[PDB]
Structures are given as structure tokens and as C-alpha cells.
Amino acid sequence: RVRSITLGNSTITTQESANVVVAYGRWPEYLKDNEATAEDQPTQPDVATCRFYTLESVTWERDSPGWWWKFPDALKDMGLFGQNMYYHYLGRAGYTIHVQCNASKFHQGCLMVVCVPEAEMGCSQVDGTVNEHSLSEGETAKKFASTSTNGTNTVQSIVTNAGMGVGVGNLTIFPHQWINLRTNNCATIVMPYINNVPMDNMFRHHNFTLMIIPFVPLDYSSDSSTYVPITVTVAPMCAEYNGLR
Amino acid sequence: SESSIENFLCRSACVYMGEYHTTNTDTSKLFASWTINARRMVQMRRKLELFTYVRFDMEVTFVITSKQDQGTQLGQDMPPLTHQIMYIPPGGPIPKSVTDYTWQTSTNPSIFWTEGNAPPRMSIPFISIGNAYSNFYDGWSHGVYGYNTLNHMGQIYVRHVNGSSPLPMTSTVRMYFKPKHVKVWVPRPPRLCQYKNASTVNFTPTNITEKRQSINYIPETV
Amino acid sequence: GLPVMNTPGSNQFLTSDDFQSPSAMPQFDVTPELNIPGEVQNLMEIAEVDSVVPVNNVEGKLDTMEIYRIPVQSGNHQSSQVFGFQVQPGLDNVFKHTLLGEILNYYAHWSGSIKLTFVFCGSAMATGKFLLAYAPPGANAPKSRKDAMLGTHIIWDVGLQSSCVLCIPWISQTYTSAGNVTCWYQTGIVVPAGTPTSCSIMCFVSACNDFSVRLLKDTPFI
């Protein structure tokens, strides 16, 4: 009851009892042919964009508020998919995201894993503006805080308002999955391309945001490990660019 | 049936009220202007933020009232007043005086109306080179965070249509706005914090809800 | 030609009228629609989604993640209450700011059935029993574990199931005249050596398919 999956020259292993969320019922696909027939011809890499990219693990401790990543540009240094971001003026893609934990039966805790489109964030100063570095750091995660933040140009990252001004118990409206250390330790989310235009430039726009948020904190006792590792793996799907010839 | 999208959003509201004179010594008080967006009406803003992408037509009605200034001169006998209401599409010339050439450009649609009649009304289609409007944008304008140029919807300008050396008068216009044939995509959670300004999502941290006495407390039954 | 007669109501502006209007941009072909994933036809598609309830809304923790966690304590307390609340979406503080509560607060009359889910977030070594009890509207909340057993209840063994589900059938709106739900320790929690002592429960609320709303009004939150 273990499946082994190979994309390109990558191989990972999952359990065949996985559960998969397809975001709004829609699988990813190519914009078919004839939105812009004449002088808008696209191309597709399909070479080493369809392959598993694995980020660094994060460390879940007793007081961890949460983590977030921006897509794309979490992959702007990831081999070929990142090269294509510099060579081409427009693009699009869907994604498959796997999130996994490594824990024992003597640990306990609960995580929400959610993919949020257009996650526009607020500044720590009400009459201020957010910086580009405070929104993302690429393949390194940003951190939520457990109290309200200060300083100039920083996202106001108190975890109960999720940086967007809503109640964090209501983020289940988005494509999401629960990880309860008692019953499962994995989550797969398949995201299609969602925009109000068919293609776009991939450097000054963040299509979506992946967030991981503990709702019940990690607990252990006498001589268990004091942390739990979380691992994120991403495979781009049906990527497509403007033709160069 | 009352929770359909059309019955929830397609409702009229006053979104701008402005004043303008026939004679003045400021020359910006001689006309009134408004930029069309749905972010300075706090009740419509919140209902619109439940979705990420929207598509609609606009309908605008104008209620216009005049007054003679309390300055001094009485015994007048005046004909009814005429007004001009000009819509500028995105990518159009903007007037800066009431005597400007742009009040006569053939591609700015315009309405001429005289008091005493029914209130004037124009209908604007979905105007965007994109496929939908967006209530949320996680990007840069090219650089302002959260602002994309596909959301431009145009402007409205109002003036008096007198001749030379007119008599002093003060008018007020109220604009009533209504979206029609509406379609929405990607639902979102409702805004929990108060709005702080009209262009950002900035906020001060807010409590999740209000307290009670204890986790067991249920009020005595009647 | 064509003799004609004007009726009362002519030349009035009614804010909710429905008439054809002249277009100000007739020679403009609009951008065709895109097939964006995630389209919505009705607000009841938002209320049928689960959201986390802040059941622990007591003093000192209205601004932390702790507001969402029901505490299960360690040791032997096998007849004490764990929690209890009245089921009043829209009005009561614990249900007021959820996805279902936020919708219901746009309408002056609503009715349907409600779904509550409970989930145990402890270690896989812990075992024990809870008693979940429901009192109808017009009944007092039970004071002991025994009289809660004498009504409608379910006995929930967390060593066997990690989650329980309840469906409540007679919900309307306006010292409440509403039903209530309570939870009791049947046995107490038992663990082996080397596992955490305390733990937590979480509540999710949603609406069932037969939910209806009437008389759109203004919300009291902005």
C-alpha cells in the first residue's frame, strides 16, 4: 500500500490511500487554441518543468505561528522552470502540491493547509505601504506572528487575521486540507491557473499563496523529539509561454 | 431566490454628491467630477468583496437641484437652467477649465438636460480589455502595490450650459449607480476589520468575536 | 397621431424601477467572457461550507488561536461538563462571525437545518468517552450527566472515531427560546506512559441544503 511516482528524473513515494482536492472541480489544461489565433502563438516546455521540486523542510515546534509562500517566484531559482521565467515575456501554469509531516503516535497537533488566490496583504502601518521583500523571500518561507507587528513596510502578520483582514477560522472557503496527526500526515492540492486574463507576466504578479497554519499546537512529552518536520513538493502542470519565432 | 447573485448585487445607491457654481473666483468650483470605482461606498464595497472577479454593466441616474445664491440681487425672472453631463471613457481627454476644448470632443458621450423634466440617465457597458474586473490584485502596477490598470472605468463631469456673463447660481448633483447583468467568480471570506482608506486593504488587528461569561454559559430559558 | 394619456407615476424616479436605458457607447464591442474556474450562482453555496467556531470566547483570549480550542483536561473527572451553548446562528456571539452567520445577517428572516461536526485533536494513544446531548427549544439545559442521558444524546468513543456529526432540524430567529447542546465526561481520558496529558476538541458549523432567506437588509458590522 505504497505508490512510487516518477516525473522526469525525479522520484517520490506516497501512500495509495491519499486524498486529493481538485481546487474548484477543474483540472489544469492548455488554453485550447483560438482565443488569439493570428499573432499570438504559444509554446510549451514539457521538458523539465514537469518534475518534482522539493523545497527545504520547515520545523514545527511548540510555538510556531505559521508559514506562507508565494507562487510563482518560489520557483524562480528552480532549474528550468526558473530559466523560462526570464526568457519568456508571458506564461501560465497549474500545480500539484504535496505536503507531508514526519511524526510519531506519541505526538499530537492539527494543521490547516490552504491555497489562496490573490492574497493581497496589509501593512503594519495603516497609512503605509508594503515592501517587496516583506511579501516574499523566494523559496524561504515568511512567518506569521502571534502578536501584532510593527516596523515600516512590513506585512501586518498577526496570525488571527492572516494578513488579509479576515477571521482565520473562515479560510475554509478556499481550497484547503486538514492534517490531524492522529489520523493522517499528508495533503495533496491540485491548483489550476486562475486569472482574469489568459496569460500574464510572472514577475510582478503573485497568482496564489500557499499557507500552513497550526490550529492546535504541537505537544509531546518526556523524551520524544522536540520538533516535527514538514516537507513541500511542487510539480508544475501544463505550462505554456509566448512563442519566440 | 432572494439569495441569487442578481438580487443580492443589483440595487441602486447614491455614491457621489457634489456642488458647482456658475460664477466663482476659484474656477474649480465651476464644475463637478467623479472617478468611477466601487471602493468609497462602504456598504457596496463589502458586498463586492465576497468575490474575486466581477463583470457587470453600469446604469447611472442623476438628481440635480439649483439655488440662487444669498448674495444680494432680487427681482429676477429666469428661464430654466441647462446642464451638461459628460462621460469620459478610459483613455480620454480630461477638462481642466469649464471653457476647455474637451467639453466638445466628439468621442466623449454627453447629455444635455433642462430642469423640470424627468431625471437623466445613461447606460455604460462592460469596458475592459480584460475579461473581468478584479476586486483584489496581488501585484504591482508596473510601482504601486495592489493596483492594476485593467480596472479603469472612466469619469463623469458636470457643468452649466449658459452663455457669456451668467447670473450666479449654485447646483448640487447626486449620482445613483446600479450594476446589471452581473457575474462573479471565486468566493472569499467577509471583511472582519474596518476599512482604513480607499485604495489599500490596510487594517488594525481585530478581535475574532465578543466574549461571554464561561465556556458553559447558556442563558436561562423563558 | 396615436391618442395617448399619461397616468400617475409619470416622470418620477423610482430607485427600484426596471426599464430599458439608452447606451452611451453603442459602437463598442465588448470583450468576450472567459471560462474562469469557481463561478457562483447563489449565496447559499457560501453558507454550505464548514467554518471553525470560536467556542472558547472567554476573557483573555479573544485575540489568539486559543479561542477555537475546547480544552480536555487530564485525570479523572467523569461527570463534569466540557462545554455547552445555545444554537442561535446570526444572534449568538459564538456563531455570529462564521461563514453561515455572516450571510444570515444580511436577511431579516431565515430558516433551515444546521450541521455541527466535532473533531478530537489528541494523540493516537488516548481513549475515553464523551456524552453529546441536545435539548430542543423551550427546554432547559441539563444540569447533570444523568439527565442529559435521559434525553437525546450520542455516546462518542474517541478511541474508535475521531469525529462526530449532528444535524439540528428547527432553526429560526426572532431568555432565548432556542435549543442547546452540551458535552459531558462519561469516563475520562486514559493514556500510556510518554504521551501528552491534555488535549483539544474543535467544532465546525455548516448549513444543510434546505436553507432559506428573505428580506434583504443592511448588515450591522461596518
Place this chain on the structure above:
Amino acid sequence: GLPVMNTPGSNQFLTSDDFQSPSAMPQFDVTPELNIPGEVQNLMEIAEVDSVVPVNNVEGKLDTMEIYRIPVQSGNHQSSQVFGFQVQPGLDNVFKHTLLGEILNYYAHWSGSIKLTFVFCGSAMATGKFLLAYAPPGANAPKSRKDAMLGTHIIWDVGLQSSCVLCIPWISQTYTSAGNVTCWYQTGIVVPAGTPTSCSIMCFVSACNDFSVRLLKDTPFI
């Protein structure tokens, strides 16, 4: 007779309305139409015509025929640039006053494909090679002959062909975010004894059949 009811909008003058009007000269039969050559149904028939581009719009020659001539110099300069520009009809000075540019400036949104033709006006004894290179929007302009060769380009031998043609596919409007075109000396120009030393190139621009325009507005030139 015939009970009737006046709606809002009655007795208003809407500048863009469309109603039947009474004729002031009903008893007058009009002159029948003549079949004049050269009738027009659509403005895109004017934009599909080539017109000469003033590529040499530098100081000291904005009022001479020299503004239209790209200079080709004599001797050996076989890696230097000949010319380069961004492709931005409507906004950029070199394309702004052509037949295509003048039309596009009546509309606030437009899009399509563009056609550029280059013609060599030297003596029939001259030979040599040019490299014509295209960079897409969002790419920097090439700095050398070699990196222009590493992109999309054509090598144009003027001893074989007197003219070259290019079709550019992704044109829209609003430190530009537009594509560009550049020309490089591959070899240098070679002549026999008794022929002029210097020479010229000319550019023609036009639109291809798939061109569209929206939101008529006022032009910024008179």
C-alpha cells in the same frame, strides 16, 4: 382613452438617444445618389494602407525630407548598429503621426498585428548584408551583433532583394514594456568604381487584417 402611465426619463434630452423625428421638409424629393468611385465602409480600410515612417526624428531635421531616410554609410563598419526603435503605435513619436497612428489615437483600446516593410534605395551596383532583429515585450534590446543573432532575426542581402517584410503579433497599449526592432551591419557596403558611396533605407508601416478598436474618444492633436 387608452390608459397610459409616464415612466422616469420622460421629457429629458439624452445626447445619445435614438428616436424618430418629424421632418421639416416633407414635400421635397431628394437628389438620387451617384456611383462615385472610392467609397468607404470602415476606418480600418484607412489603417491597412502603408505610410512612410519618420525614423530619423532627431534634432535639426524635423522639417525636411531627411527625417524619412535612414543613413547607410560607406566603408567597413561590420558590427555597428544602423537603427533601432520600440514598436508602440499611437504613443511613440516615430509612429504617432502615420496613417495607422492617427486612427489609433481616436480610440482608448486597440489591439492587433503590425506589418513593417524596409526598402533599400541605393544604386544597383551595391552589395552587402544587414541583420534585422526582433525582441519581444519584456525583453531588453540587444547590445551587440552577436546577441541579436542569438534571437529572432533575418539576414537581408541587398544585392539579392531590395525589400524585406516583418509581421509583429502581440500589439496593445497602456520603461515601455514593448518589443523592439534593431538593425546591424553584417558586412558593410561594397561598390565598384564610379558609384555613389553613401545610401539610404526607408520604412513603411501598416496594419494587418485582424485589427480592432474600442471606446471612441477625442483626439489630442487639435
Place this chain on the structure above:
Amino acid sequence: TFVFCGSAMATGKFLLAYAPPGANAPKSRKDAMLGTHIIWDVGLQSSCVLCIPWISQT
């Protein structure tokens, strides 16, 4: 094949990564994620399998 020999109560995650011939070995967890990899949860599976396709010698 890799097999985890710990107690049945232990949980956690590993990242297993493969670089082809002619490529350098990854230096961090993030660039190993950006190549071919599998994420292995030992609370779910006790063993993982890999098949490597281009093997020759000097």
C-alpha cells in the same frame, strides 16, 4: 530500497533527491526540492523504492 527501522510510534518526513550524471550534488533542502525528489512519510510507509535509468562505467 530504503526501510525505516524505528518504533511504530514515530512520525516524520524525509526528502529523497536524485541528481543525474553531470550535475552537482544539492547543497540545501530547497534546491533538492527544486529537482527530482520524493517526500517520504514514515508514519504512513515503512519503505521507499527508486529506479535509476542510465548506469554505465569508465
